[PDB]
Structure 1
Amino acid sequence: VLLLDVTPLSLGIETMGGVMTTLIAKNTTIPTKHSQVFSTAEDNQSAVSIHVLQGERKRAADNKSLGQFNLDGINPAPRGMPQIEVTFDIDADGILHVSAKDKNSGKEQKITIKASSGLNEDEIQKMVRDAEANAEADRKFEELVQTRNQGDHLLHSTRKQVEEAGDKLPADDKTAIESALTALETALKGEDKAAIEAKMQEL
């Protein structure tokens, strides 16, 4: 009642896009545990790398990496179908317990990060400040990756849709497609939202 144990910065995992998904939000009174179900990005993806991070930025790259672990043995499946649950657990001691478990095959890996781990009080204030200094440039990244990821989804949707009607697709339609798809993917590697939405439009 007089003082409270709180997480100084948010804790989460890096996801598709180079972004960072927060599982334990900033200033949560630590004895807390949160779990969110994620999946794979690619078809027949056999393992996922759980990259633990601490920070407030949108780029997983602009945060503190607390550790990383792999959860493999994911039985081949269409991308977006395997179920992987990541669970962030911080006890009163402030020790972080990050586990991942294939909600089907039963497999589960674990990593335990001690409370001395992370950005010190100094780094914590700089993190918080840069978060604010860059808040908008960060917003640019958010809208960028959402679109980028959606361009990824189209590249595949389309690519597979070709098979679903291979010969049904007359040459200079089917050829007109294979071409732009090449174009979009290159754009996705880029970071121009305007350009990506364009190559998306082209397809």
Structure 2
Amino acid sequence: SIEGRVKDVLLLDVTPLSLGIETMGGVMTTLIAKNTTIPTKHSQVFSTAEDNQSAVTIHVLQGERKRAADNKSLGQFNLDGINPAPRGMPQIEVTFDIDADGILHVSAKDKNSGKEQKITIKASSGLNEDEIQKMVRDAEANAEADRKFEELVQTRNQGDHLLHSTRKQVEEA
């Protein structure tokens, strides 16, 4: 009775915690999940929020549950200038493929002209379910509740598709 639910890598030689993008609301949505055996390949298409096609911050989030204590850093940057086009499209396909060696080959590929930006994120770590749930108390109550709502949501909550394309305020990692 270990109550496994977050992680499970024993009879699943898969990607390791569930992982895709911090989403609107102070939530976590996976791009590629566990039960996806390496090497993997899977497409997930979304739209930009305030752009039709002009920018996607890529701030990938490796965690699991919907309460955001699922803040494992798979963080990124920003694809920008995808032709002048504002709000709603809804075509920016975001493909997610891991290689067999263990590097995340993910390309935010836009359906404007195939303008893309590929990332190669290393990813090997431990983490457990109350690194996440321990983080739900201290950090889910305050970390991404207030930081992610305030400048990653514009505090309003929404859902999926619109992936919060911030124009100004570049996140200088």
TM-score category of the 2 structures, normalised to the smaller one:
0.5 to 0.7
Measured on the aligned residues, the alpha-carbon RMSD in Å equals: 7.8
Q: Which whole-Å CA distance do the structure 1 matches of 2:162 and 2:113 have between them?
A: 29
The alpha-carbon deviation at position 70 of structure 1 amounts to 1.4
The match for 1:70 is 78
**Larger strand percent:** 2
The answer (yes or no) to whether the contact 2:17–2:63 under 8 Å persists in 1 is yes
Q: Does the 8 Å CA contact 1:69/1:111 hold for their aligned counterparts? A: no
Bigger RCO (CA 8 Å, 6+ sep): 2
Alignment deviations for residues 94-139 of structure 1 (CA, whole Å, 9 cap, x no partner):
2211210111232111111123357489958978999999999999
CA distance in 1, matches of 2:79, 2:150: 27
CA contact (8 A) 1:73 1:107 kept: no
Count of aligned pairs:
164
Matching residue of 2:44? 36
Identity fraction in percent? 99
Give the drift of 1:75: 2.2
Asked whether the equivalents of residues 89 and 98 of structure 1 are also in contact (C-alpha less than 8 Å), the reply is yes
When the two structures are superposed, what TM-score results if normalisation uses the length of structure 1? 0.54
Maintained 8 Å contact 2:48/2:161: no
Do 2:19 and 2:62's aligned partners in 1 also have CA atoms closer than 8 Å? yes
**In 2 relative to 1, CA 28–73 (structure 1 residues): closer, same or farther, beyond 3 Å?**
same
User: For structure 1, which segment, 1-10 or 22-31, has the greater mean C-alpha deviation from structure 2 after superposition?
Assistant: 1-10
CA contact (8 A) 1:100 1:109 kept: yes
Determine if contact 1:19/1:145 at 8 Å carries over to the other structure: no
For structure 1, list consecutive stretches of 5 or more residues without a partner in the other structure.
165-203
1:127-162 superposed Cα distances (whole Å, 9 cap, x missing partner): 899999999999999999999445999999999999
Q: Which structure carries more helix by proportion?
A: 1
Contact 2:47–2:161 (Cα < 8 Å) also in 1: no
User: Partner of 1:123: helix, strand, or coil?
Assistant: helix
Task: Give the CA deviation at 1:92.
Answer: 2.1
Tell me the equivalent position of 1:16: 24
CA, structure 1 residues 14+150, in 2 after alignment: closer, same or farther (shift >3 Å)? Answer: closer
Instruction: Return the index of the structure with the highest Cα Rg.
Output: 1
Distance 1:99 1:120, change over 3 A: farther
Separation in 2, partners of 1:102, 1:79: 14
1:11 CA displacement: 1.2
